Curated annotation (Swiss-Prot):
The keyword Mitochondrion applies. Keywords: Mitochondrion, Phosphoprotein, Ribonucleoprotein, Ribosomal protein. GO terms for biological process: mitochondrial translation; mitochondrial translational initiation. This is Small ribosomal subunit protein bS1m. Belongs to the bacterial ribosomal protein bS1 family. Component of the mitochondrial ribosome (mitoribosome), a dedicated translation machinery responsible for the synthesis of mitochondrial genome-encoded proteins, including at least some of the essential transmembrane subunits of the mitochondrial respiratory chain. The mitoribosomes are attached to the mitochondrial inner membrane and translation products are cotranslationally integrated into the membrane. bS1m functionally interacts with the 5'-UTR of mitochondrial mRNAs. One of its GO terms (molecular function) is structural constituent of ribosome. Its main location: mitochondrion. It is found in: Mitochondrion. Component of the mitochondrial small ribosomal subunit (mt-SSU). Mature yeast 74S mitochondrial ribosomes consist of a small (37S) and a large (54S) subunit. The 37S small subunit contains a 15S ribosomal RNA (15S mt-rRNA) and 34 different proteins. The 54S large subunit contains a 21S rRNA (21S mt-rRNA) and 46 different proteins. One of its GO terms (cellular component) is mitochondrial inner membrane. It comes from Saccharomyces cerevisiae (strain ATCC 204508 / S288c). Coiled coil: none annotated.
Length: 114
RNA sequence: AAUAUGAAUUAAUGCGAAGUUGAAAUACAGUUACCGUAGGGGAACCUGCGGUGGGCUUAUAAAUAUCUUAAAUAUUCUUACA
């Protein structure tokens, strides 16, 4: 059915987020999912959102909150810069270690009631 | 006692022409107007108290914005590729 397809659509895959797109507090990790469009689609203002992104946007990365609003605009910011922070961390090749010597969370360890 | 008539006597008002004394109202009408009420004054009107808008909704910024392969690759593409 159409409902089944919609639930699995790429737009459905992005978790609902209404966090401020302009946040001036302390940032410790990414808050919005970066959206990327290919160069061919960018030439046609196609991002896979509800409406065409304004042609003024030359970046290929954005973050958004609402597909449409009462102001008849998309709420988005044309930035994708948290990906470069992650890739620069990867280039520094420093593994993240636990200062408390806890078990690795990414391994299925056999824990006990200690 | 009622009804009708006339009535000394006396009250209110309309229209007509037509000047006079002011300039109260319509614009922020030159003191916002009007409602109720009270007092005062040649005349409109003036003043006090509250009410109404049938006057002020007539309302319109203390400005400041961001990084990924610009192309041998996107931009071309005509039912083709798959
Ligand atoms: K007056
Ligand atoms: K009055
Ligand atoms: K009065
Ligand atoms: Mg006067
Ligand atoms: Mg006058
Ligand atoms: Mg006046
Ligand atoms: Mg007086
Ligand atoms: Mg008054
Ligand atoms: Mg008036
Ligand atoms: Mg008015």
């Amino acid at each position: 059915t159409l409902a089944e397809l919609l639930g699995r659509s790429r737009i459905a895959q992005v978790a609902n987020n209404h966090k401020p797109l302009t946040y001036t507090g302390k940032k410790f990790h990414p808050t919005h999912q970066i959206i990327e469009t290919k160069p061919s689609t960018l030439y046609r203002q196609e991002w896979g959102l509800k409406s065409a992104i304004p042609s003024k946007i030359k970046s290929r990365y954005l973050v958004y909150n609402d597909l449409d609003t009462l102001e008849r605009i998309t709420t988005f910011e044309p930035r994708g810069g948290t990906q470069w922070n992650r890739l620069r961390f990867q280039e520094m090749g420093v593994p993240i270690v636990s200062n408390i010597g806890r078990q690795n969370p990414f391994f299925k360890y056999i824990s006990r009631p200690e």
